[PDB]
Amino acid sequence: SVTISLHPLVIMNISEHWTRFPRQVYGALIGKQKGRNIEIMNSFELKTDVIGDETVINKDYYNKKEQQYKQVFSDLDFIGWYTTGDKIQRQIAAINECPIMLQLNPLSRSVDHLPLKLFES
Amino acid sequence: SVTISLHPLVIMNISEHWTRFRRQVYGALIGKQKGRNIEIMNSFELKTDVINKDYYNKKEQQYKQVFSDLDFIGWYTTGDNDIKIQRQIAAINECPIMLQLNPLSRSVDH
Numbered sequence: 001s002v003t004i005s006l007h008p009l010v011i012m013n014i015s016e017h018w019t020r021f022p023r024q025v026y027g028a029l030i031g032k033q034k035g036r037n038i039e040i041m042n043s044f045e046l047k048t049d050v051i052g053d054e055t056v057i058n059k060d061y062y063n064k065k066e067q068q069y070k071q072v073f074s075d076l077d078f079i080g081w082y083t084t085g086d087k088i089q090r091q092i093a094a095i096n097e098c099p100i101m102l103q104l105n106p107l108s109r110s111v112d113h114l115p116l117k118l119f120e121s
Numbered sequence: 122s123v124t125i126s127l128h129p130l131v132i133m134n135i136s137e138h139w140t141r142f143r144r145q146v147y148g149a150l151i152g153k154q155k156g157r158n159i160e161i162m163n164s165f166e167l168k169t170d171v172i173n174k175d176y177y178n179k180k181e182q183q184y185k186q187v188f189s190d191l192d193f194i195g196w197y198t199t200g201d202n203d204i205k206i207q208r209q210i211a212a213i214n215e216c217p218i219m220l221q222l223n224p225l226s227r228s229v230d231h
Binding site for chain 2: 001002003004005006007008009011039097098099100101102103104105106107121
């Protein structure tokens with residue numbers, strides 16, 4: 001039971017991240033929240049490195065970007081993660097209309113094995 | 122603490138609904154959920170005059186008949202409708218899509 005207020009800019013960001021691009025993308029959500037009301041207002045891309053068949057989020061880049069975003073959008077915080085990407089699945093994915101997955105208020109802010117953290121659900 | 126998996130078709134539908142309109146728009150979300158995982162897979166427009174209760178019941182029945190693995194999981198709303206300037210130039214500013222998931226009543230007010 002929750003209310004999400006999702007700004008178009010976020011949809012835009014995620015979609016563009018996916019377009020300019022292993023076959024998943026990942027990022028951070030930023031916004032505000034009070035009780036069960038969550039405003040998702042912005043987001044940034046996580047840089048990854050493929051180590052043979054494994055996608056690894058770049059920890060240092062994440063800490064850097066988060067710092068920056070906090071300096072610039074000082075009324076907002078990290079509120080979670082997004083990810084998106086690749087008969088019927090072939091067609092939806094080839095036209096790029098895969099689901100956007102939004103994980104809000106995860107239990108760790110840790111980016112280590114993030115893909116496996118996310119996909120465990 | 123929750124995971125939403127949002128299908129583009131839903132964003133599409135909501136956007137279409139808002140575009141074809143002449144200052145808020147309302148609709149129903151349908152999908153699946155297990156624990157804190159919610160999949161929002163489809164949606165339908167609510168006719169208004171005040172939400173039209175009969176039309177809502179009708180459409181929900183239909184959607185349940187067609188998408189039988191899915192259920193009602195909440196409401197969306199969007200459109201123009203505190204900061205003065207946010208009011209004056211609302212029509213050219215971005216409008217958030219509001220998604221209310223697992224409301225306490227399935228009753229058709231707000």
